[PDB]
Design a protein around this ligand. Structure first.
Ligand code: HEM
Ligand code: HEM
Ligand code: HEM
Ligand code: HEM
Lengths: 141, 146, 141, 146
């Protein structure tokens, strides 16, 4: 579970993301594609070339969802229900891939927020991404 | 170890700019902070109660430098990691009893640490070379478990 | 989430285990130790040789806890509080390992309850061990 | 593989007693039931609405036989699973888009099917060698993903 501290941390670090969320979302994806090529199997229909608008488009949607979980940090299961449904029933992404994206999102944030990416914040963001992943995977079986 | 020459040059170029003393302490300290369970191996290190207590503990800093020291040597034998890490693998297994999954966790944390430090310089493709490397090292460290 | 069919199937299967759960507990550990030698890192203090009383006893302990779980299939979180505590704050076994014991336990039931280890029963027991694993690692952070 | 002659012999000898026809249909069908999400690749097979419907579906059974066949032949190149599954690895990646994780789910189901079948015969030491083969197959098959 996320503690008050964690919650503060996440709102704070994400606060700083502001308007770059979209771009950071696109970048996390590209990092993921390059470091874990197996994740590509889920996007056979995408142009995964560098600067692909499909990826930009997708990075933004991922970023809006993360942004929505932060706004509803106290009711994530309900704020993300729909996306939980989609992932369980339609996309059926294997669970191990959430940790990969989580990881690439953390690298991205670290690469952009040197001042905020403190040990304490890193830990909070990690627990958060893990909780988001848990929600998205909750209805799998 | 599917390091393309271009991947190996890239690993090597960046490793050139690292302060192993420094990086070692940050990586280690950060691990104890993000995955507090890993603190199980260091109860003789003293106070790890808070991030500051961990990050600043002289023992964590000194140990981190040791670990990265061994890792650095590893990078000079990218061809023979298994050989390089053999006595260490035995030790972690037989004396320390460290579950090898620990080696992968540290690799990921390390990657975030490099991203943290190098910003924009830690490009998608540089990250992918380091992914192969942390994985090679973890595997080499786990090779003598039994 | 365990469906009613599932809770039924589990209770049946476990129902047939009977006086042998302890032996199955012991057998699963042995299969785990041989197939996944990395799991041995958690028992440096045990004699892991075939027929060790340390292993047999531990086998019983595990077996018993599963029994208790089947019995409170409706309230696992609660029936296993203490155990989730122990694992999260003292043992601190890494989560990957739960999947390995769960698998050696299926193999063991399969090898001992042929008629009963139907495809639907197999699916159920699996979800079940999954649920149990989730419960035992829920307080990790 | 990192199989011991002793380990090689154990694999080899149990295999000798296997009905690939029966074991292939049961391993694949069990998969479709235990891990329902693997059904995403077999929509064209029919109704997999129930254990019964999966276990009964001939398309399933026949795919199961094609799979264990290929696996069976892999057991003859235990010292180069990589070279034996190269083309099958590309195919799975490039044509079928099968996530390699699936290869690991099946392997574990395979092991439950063998135990199911051989009872007593499938001893801890024998499962141990089989676990190494199933991991080895999965790795080989995943080797060409990019
Ligand atoms: C916390 C992590 C994740 C979040 C927040 C997230 C969120 C989303 C959202 C908002 C969408 C678009 C739904 C729509 O069309 O409105 C989406 C689609 C999708 N996601 Fe997830 N996702 C996550 C993890 C993953 C992972 C790990 C993968 C696979 C590696 C994945 C694969 C997909 C695919 C294939 C689609 C559909 C894309 C398309 O066809 O346009 N997702 N996700
Ligand atoms: C890149 C991976 C790693 C490398 C290269 C590495 C290297 C080392 C070295 C050089 C030593 C000292 C050897 C000696 O005492 O003779 C050591 C000791 C130790 N390592 Fe590792 N290590 C790694 C990962 C880890 C991880 C992830 C953990 C725990 C989660 C760990 C736990 C320990 C412990 C507990 C000690 C002994 C400390 C003491 O003196 O009390 N190591 N390691
Ligand atoms: C299926 C899930 C599991 C259950 C129900 C379970 C249950 C138990 C029980 C009942 C105990 C004994 C508590 C006591 O001594 O009062 C125990 C202890 C322990 N468990 Fe877990 N366990 C599970 C999974 C695991 C796994 C996968 C591992 C590591 C591979 C593990 C490692 C340990 C260890 C090291 C002990 C203490 C042994 C000793 O010193 O006696 N457990 N567990
Ligand atoms: C033991 C590991 C496996 C082996 C050796 C294997 C082997 C094969 C072979 C030999 C084919 C024949 C196709 C051709 O030559 O055109 C095939 C097709 C296929 N496999 Fe795999 N397979 C394995 C695992 C899996 C798994 C786990 C899945 C999905 C759960 C899967 C999905 C498929 C599909 C969808 C096809 C195409 C069937 C069709 O054309 O209708 N495979 N596989």
């Amino acid at each position: 579970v996320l503690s008050p501290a964690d919650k503060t941390n996440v709102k704070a670090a994400w606060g700083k993301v502001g308007a770059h969320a979209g771009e950071y979302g696109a970048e996390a994806l590209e990092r993921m594609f390059l470091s874990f090529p197996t994740t590509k199997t889920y996007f056979p229909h995408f142009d995964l070339s560098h600067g692909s608008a499909q990826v930009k488009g997708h990075g933004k949607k991922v970023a809006d969802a993360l942004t929505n979980a932060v706004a509803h940090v106290d009711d994530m299961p309900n704020a993300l229900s729909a996306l939980s449904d989609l992932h369980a029933h339609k996309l059926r992404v294997d669970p191990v891939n959430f940790k990969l994206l989580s990881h690439c999102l953390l690298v991205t944030l670290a690469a952009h927020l040197p001042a905020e990416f403190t040990p304490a914040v890193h830990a909070s963001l990690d627990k958060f991404l893990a909780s988001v992943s848990t929600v998205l995977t909750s209805k799998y079986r | 170890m599917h390091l393309t020459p271009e991947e190996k040059s890239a690993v090597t170029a960046l490793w050139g700019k690292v302060n192993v003393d420094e990086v070692g302490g940050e990586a280690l300290g950060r691990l104890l902070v993000v995955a507090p369970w890993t603190q199980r191996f260091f109860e003789s290190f003293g106070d790890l109660s808070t991030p500051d207590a961990v990050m600043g503990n002289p023992k964590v800093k000194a140990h981190g430098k040791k670990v990265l020291g061994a890792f650095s040597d590893g990078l000079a034998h990218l061809d023979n990691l298994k050989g390089t890490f053999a006595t260490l693998s035995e030790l972690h297994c037989d004396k320390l009893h460290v579950d090898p999954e620990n080696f992968r966790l540290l690799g990921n944390v390390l990657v975030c640490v490099l991203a943290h430090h190098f910003g924009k310089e830690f490009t998608p493709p540089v990250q992918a070379a380091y992914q192969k490397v942390v994985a090679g090292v973890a595997n080499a460290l786990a090779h003598k478990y039994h």
